Design an enzyme around this catalytic site. Structure first.
Site, PDB file in Angstrom:
ATOM      1  N   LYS A  26       0.846  -1.199   0.000  1.00  0.00           N
ATOM      2  CA  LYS A  26       0.000   0.000   0.000  1.00  0.00           C
ATOM      3  C   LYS A  26       0.883   1.253   0.000  1.00  0.00           C
ATOM      4  CE  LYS A  26       1.070   1.030   4.368  1.00  0.00           C
ATOM      5  NZ  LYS A  26       1.683   2.364   4.766  1.00  0.00           N
TER       6      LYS A  26
ATOM      7  N   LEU B 281       5.163   0.709   3.400  1.00  0.00           N
ATOM      8  CA  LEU B 281       4.337   0.162   2.308  1.00  0.00           C
ATOM      9  C   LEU B 281       3.564  -1.059   2.769  1.00  0.00           C
ATOM     10  CD1 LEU B 281       7.058   0.206  -0.496  1.00  0.00           C
ATOM     11  CD2 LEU B 281       5.352   1.975  -0.147  1.00  0.00           C
TER      12      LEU B 281
ATOM     13  N   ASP C 128      -2.611  -1.145   9.911  1.00  0.00           N
ATOM     14  CA  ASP C 128      -2.334  -1.974   8.672  1.00  0.00           C
ATOM     15  C   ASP C 128      -3.080  -3.235   8.267  1.00  0.00           C
ATOM     16  OD1 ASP C 128       0.211  -2.552  10.249  1.00  0.00           O
ATOM     17  OD2 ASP C 128       0.707  -0.566   9.322  1.00  0.00           O
TER      18      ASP C 128
HETATM   19  C1  LIG Z   1       3.984   2.126  21.743  1.00  0.00           C
HETATM   20  C2  LIG Z   1       4.106   3.477  21.014  1.00  0.00           C
HETATM   21  O1  LIG Z   1       4.328   3.366  19.565  1.00  0.00           O
HETATM   22  C3  LIG Z   1       3.174   3.450  18.824  1.00  0.00           C
HETATM   23  O2  LIG Z   1       2.094   3.127  19.332  1.00  0.00           O
HETATM   24  C4  LIG Z   1       3.251   3.945  17.351  1.00  0.00           C
HETATM   25  C5  LIG Z   1       2.533   3.046  16.297  1.00  0.00           C
HETATM   26  N1  LIG Z   1       1.148   3.470  15.781  1.00  0.00           N
HETATM   27  C6  LIG Z   1       0.680   2.956  14.539  1.00  0.00           C
HETATM   28  C7  LIG Z   1      -0.573   3.293  14.028  1.00  0.00           C
HETATM   29  C8  LIG Z   1      -1.030   2.768  12.751  1.00  0.00           C
HETATM   30  C9  LIG Z   1      -1.428   2.312  11.635  1.00  0.00           C
HETATM   31  C10 LIG Z   1      -1.839   1.732  10.323  1.00  0.00           C
HETATM   32  N2  LIG Z   1      -1.935   2.729   9.216  1.00  0.00           N
HETATM   33  S1  LIG Z   1      -0.503   3.158   8.413  1.00  0.00           S
HETATM   34  O3  LIG Z   1      -0.740   3.489   6.982  1.00  0.00           O
HETATM   35  O4  LIG Z   1       0.395   1.958   8.421  1.00  0.00           O
HETATM   36  C11 LIG Z   1       0.303   4.587   9.233  1.00  0.00           C
HETATM   37  C12 LIG Z   1       1.835   4.593   9.154  1.00  0.00           C
HETATM   38  C13 LIG Z   1       1.132   4.322  10.490  1.00  0.00           C
HETATM   39  C14 LIG Z   1      -1.370   4.160  14.769  1.00  0.00           C
HETATM   40  N3  LIG Z   1      -2.573   4.495  14.304  1.00  0.00           N
HETATM   41  N4  LIG Z   1      -0.944   4.650  15.950  1.00  0.00           N
HETATM   42  C15 LIG Z   1       0.265   4.355  16.476  1.00  0.00           C
HETATM   43  O5  LIG Z   1       0.566   4.875  17.558  1.00  0.00           O
HETATM   44  C16 LIG Z   1       2.617   1.548  16.619  1.00  0.00           C
HETATM   45  O6  LIG Z   1       3.105   1.320  15.268  1.00  0.00           O
HETATM   46  C17 LIG Z   1       3.506   2.710  15.181  1.00  0.00           C
END
Ligand SMILES: CCOC(=O)CC1(n2cc(C#CCNS(=O)(=O)C3CC3)c(N)nc2=O)COC1
Ligand SMILES: [Br-]
Ligand SMILES: [Cl-]
Ligand SMILES: [Cl-]
EC number: 2.7.1.148
Length: 269
Positions: free
Chosen positions: A10, A94, A131
């Protein structure tokens, strides 16, 4: 009885962060677009095994986690040997890992007479990656909540898209840690932007995780700047590292990429 399944990538055609959720963690708004860029996955009858061509340990692999959890929740023992040829680089923003998880679990769930239901399969893969359930539908969808709450849309976006992926692996966690109050927007602001992107206004794309990733990983910024130099508007997928633009790759881009170790992926939407 080996089969092959493709596992698409994606891009985020825009991302907005609304705020922090108690659990970590951030409420977002994003537009997901499936792109014709694939890992190839060979599934064979054999003893449970998940291997890649790029040295991800089995225990770390989302697909392996997913299949062990399948065993737990279903009480069926899975006899599939999985090899994934990774064209989609981990850390490229991605969703390659999440894609792998979703498509393999969907396939194995079918190959075993469909024990889990659409909503369960979705809850399963979703538990591991936010994701991951976008990849159970594909095409184009709006992601709300944390990205898992999905609304399929029809987009007016088409033609050439080019990916320029530097050999830095963006840590999404480190990106979300540089976030300040100043980066958050209202959902109303984001919803108007997304509507505009959906109608084909690609110039309305923006992504504060990309702004941040460029500050933390200078090579993402080098690619961004190079794409402008080439005369295109650059955009950033996920939290990097991928920069994309709506045009073709010139020889000068291809040369800079070979020299710098960037991957250039020319696609058509
Ligand atoms: C424990 C603290 O770190 C996090 O929670 C950050 C993270 N995160 C990830 C998330 C997500 C998602 C899915 N959509 S996506 O296109 O991949 C976007 C790039 C994140 C989100 N909505 N909130 C978050 O806080 C966990 O993976 C990154
Ligand atoms: Br903050
Ligand atoms: Cl064998
Ligand atoms: Cl860097």
């Amino acid at each position: 009885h080996m089969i092959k399944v493709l596992s698409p990538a994606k891009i985020n055609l825009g991302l907005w962060v609304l705020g922090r959720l108690p659990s970590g963690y951030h409420e977002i708004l994003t537009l997901y677009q499936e792109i014709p860029f694939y890992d190839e996955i060979y599934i064979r009858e054999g003893v449970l095994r998940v291997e890649t061509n790029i040295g991800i340990p089995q225990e770390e692999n989302l697909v392996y986690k997913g299949l062990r959890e399948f065993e737990r929740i279903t009480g069926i023992e899975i006899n599939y040997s999985i090899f994934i040829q990774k064209n989609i680089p981990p850390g490229a923003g991605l969703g390659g890992g999440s894609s792998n998880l979703a498509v393999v679990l969907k396939k194995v769930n079918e190959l075993l007479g469909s024990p889990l239901s659409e909503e369960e399969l979705r809850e399963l893969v979703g538990s591991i990656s936010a994701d991951a359930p976008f990849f159970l539908l594909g095409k184009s969808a709006i992601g709300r909540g944390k990205g898992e709450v999905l609304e399929p849309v029809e987009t007016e976006i088409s033609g050439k898209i080019t990916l320029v992926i530097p050999q830095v692996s963006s840590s999404t966690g480190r990106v979300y840690s540089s976030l300040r109050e100043e980066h958050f927007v209202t959902p109303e602001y984001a919803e108007e932007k997304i509507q505009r992107i959906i109608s084909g206004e690609v110039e309305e794309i923006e992504n504060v995780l990309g702004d941040i990733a460029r500050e933390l990983y200078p090579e993402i910024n080098e690619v961004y700047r190079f794409v402008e130099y080439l005369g295109f508007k650059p955009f950033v997928s996920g939290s990097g590292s991928t920069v994309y633009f709506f045009g073709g790759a010139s020889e000068e881009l291809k040369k800079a990429a070979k020299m710098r170790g960037w991957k250039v992926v020319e696609l058509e939407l």
